[PDB]
């Protein structure tokens, strides 16, 4: 039983936003050369006064991205399908290189990479080495620091960056399947370093360290990093619950700035480290085999850092401290001891 506050008619971004009650959305179309819609929320301030939030472009798609996604079906309608996907990948890379995404283009880009990854899988087609590099460069471009606000916009409607991590893991597994036994490839870009290894069960005799630190062939930012994971050898033992014919694909990923966009799903909580991933297929027994993850802090003045892993069991899942012990090495570094495979990070309260 109170006054009903209304956001005034407004013209931000050359569109008419009609008078709209607090709590409600206004809708509009997208700029020229895009399709979809825009929306804008009217909200109530701490002091009970209506104000407009920023317009969302989460559902605007640039024409070139839409045309790209539609051309994918044309290539499907095995070799044709796979060569097709390689062309789509090349075209996506060129696009992401022009930047000037809409938020909706970030989402569309993930959807394209997802459809490309699923197509490779269904067609039993392994992309060539330059296609692998192109895929990673695309991801690195999507994760440009500049896109941070657009990702936040996109993520009002869909967990695009989580979906992107999943697409990255699936792609890694497709590539690993086509590798030789014992083969190890590093993918390096400005924002992402990935390691992919094919490892026969029982053949791993020492713990595996990622990323390798001793080489100047390694991109600067990662070589510099004090982030790393030690993967225990025992997890590569065959279990009757796997045998001498079993082969694991091990992927490990270090992200330079994925921390800027992954959701924390908690109030006054921030991601306070880079993001590190360890993925193994088929799944081994991991119980009582602890990965040791070392993560430098991003910022000082945080309350109580703690190790989490991504739990896939909506929002495509959540962060959990279940299965991780947090070791507070010093004010600037934390060591996580986790007996589950996943995406790892340090959260902390900012208050």
Ligand X SMILES: *[C@@H]1O[C@H](CO)[C@@H](O[C@@H]2O[C@H](CO)[C@@H](O)[C@H](O)[C@H]2NC(C)=O)[C@H](O)[C@H]1NC(C)=O
Ligand Y SMILES: *[C@@H]1O[C@H](CO)[C@@H](O[C@@H]2O[C@H](CO)[C@@H](O)[C@H](O)[C@H]2NC(C)=O)[C@H](O[C@H]2O[C@@H](C)[C@@H](O)[C@@H](O)[C@@H]2O)[C@H]1NC(C)=O
Dist CA 244 CA 169 (whole Å)? 25
Residue 111 engages ligand X in binding (rule: CB under 6 A): yes
User: What are the tokens at 184?
Assistant: 């190890």
* Binding residues among 251-270 for ligand Y as defined by CB under 6 A: none
**CB proximity list for 240: less than 8 A, separation 6 or greater:** none
Minimal distance, residue 38 CB to ligand Y, in Å: 16
Of positions 66, 90, 114, 233, contacts ligand X by CB under 6 A: 114
Distance CA 89, CA 112 (A): 9
Burial of 307 (0-12, 13-18, 19+ CB in 10 A): buried
**The one segment of 19-27, 109-117, 143-151, 244-252 that binds ligand X by CB under 6 A:** 109-117
Regarding 115 and contact with ligand X (CB under 6 A), the answer is yes
Distance in angstroms (rounded) separating the CA atoms of residues 342 and 334? 17
Q: Which is nearer to ligand Y, 98 or 148 (CB)?
A: 98
Question: Residue 95 in contact with residue 68, Cβ under 8 Å?
Answer: yes
- Of 24-32, 114-122, 182-190, 338-346, which segment contacts ligand X by CB under 6 A? 114-122
Contacts of ligand Y in 17-36 (CB under 6 A): 32-33
Residue that the structure tokens 């800027």 belong to: 260
Between residues 73 and 148, which has the closer beta carbon with respect to ligand X? 73
Among 26, 60, 68, 72, binds ligand X (CB under 6 A): 72
| Cβ closest to ligand Y, residue 33 vs residue 241 | 33
Residue closer to ligand X (CB basis): 73 or 98: 73
- Interface with ligand X includes 73 (CB under 6 A)? yes
DSSP-based three-state secondary structure for 19: coil
Q: How many CA atoms lie within 13 A of 234 on its CB side?
A: 9
For binding to ligand Y (CB under 6 A), which residues are involved?
32-33
């Amino acid at each position: 039983p109170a006054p009903y506050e209304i956001c005034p008619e407004d013209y931000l971004m050359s569109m008419v936003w009609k008078r709209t009650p607090a709590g409600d959305l206004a809708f509009n179309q997208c700029p020229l050369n895009a399709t979809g819609t825009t929306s804008r929320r009217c909200s109530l301030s701490l002091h009970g006064v209506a104000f407009w939030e920023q317009p969302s472009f989460a559902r605007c798609i640039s024409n070139e991205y839409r045309h790209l996604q539609h051309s994918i079906k044309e290539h499907l309608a095995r070799m044709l399908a796979g060569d097709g996907m390689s062309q789509v990948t090349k075209t996506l890379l060129d696009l992401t290189q022009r930047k000037n995404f809409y938020a909706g283009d970030l989402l569309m880009s993930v959807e394209i990479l997802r459809n490309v990854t699923d197509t490779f899988k269904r067609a039993s087609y392994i992309p060539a080495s330059d296609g692998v590099q192109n895929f990673f460069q695309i991801v690195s471009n999507l994760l440009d620091e500049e896109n941070k606000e657009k990702w936040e916009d996109a993520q009002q409607i869909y967990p695009g960056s989580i979906e992107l991590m999943q697409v990255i893991e699936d792609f890694i597994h497709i590539v690993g399947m086509g590798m030789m036994d014992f083969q190890n490839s590093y993918l390096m870009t400005g924002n992402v370093v990935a390691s992919i290894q094919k490892l026969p069960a029982a053949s791993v005799l020492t713990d595996i360290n990622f990323p390798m630190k001793g080489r100047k062939g390694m991109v600067d930012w990662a070589r510099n990093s004090e982030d790393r994971v030690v993967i225990p050898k025992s997890i590569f033992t065959p279990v009757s619950s796997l045998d001498e014919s079993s082969v694991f694909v091990l992927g490990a990923v270090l992200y330079k700035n994925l921390d800027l966009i992954l959701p924390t799903l908690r109030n006054y909580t921030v991601i306070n480290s880079k993001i590190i991933v360890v993925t193994i297929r088929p799944e081994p027994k991991t119980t009582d085999s602890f990965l040791e993850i070392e993560l430098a802090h991003l910022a000082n003045g945080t309350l109580n850092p703690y190790c989490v892993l991504w739990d896939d069991s909506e929002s495509l899942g959540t962060w959990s401290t279940q299965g991780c012990k947090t070791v507070l090495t010093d004010a600037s570094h934390t060591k996580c001891l986790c007996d589950r495979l996943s995406t790892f990070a340090i959260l902390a309260q900012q208050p």
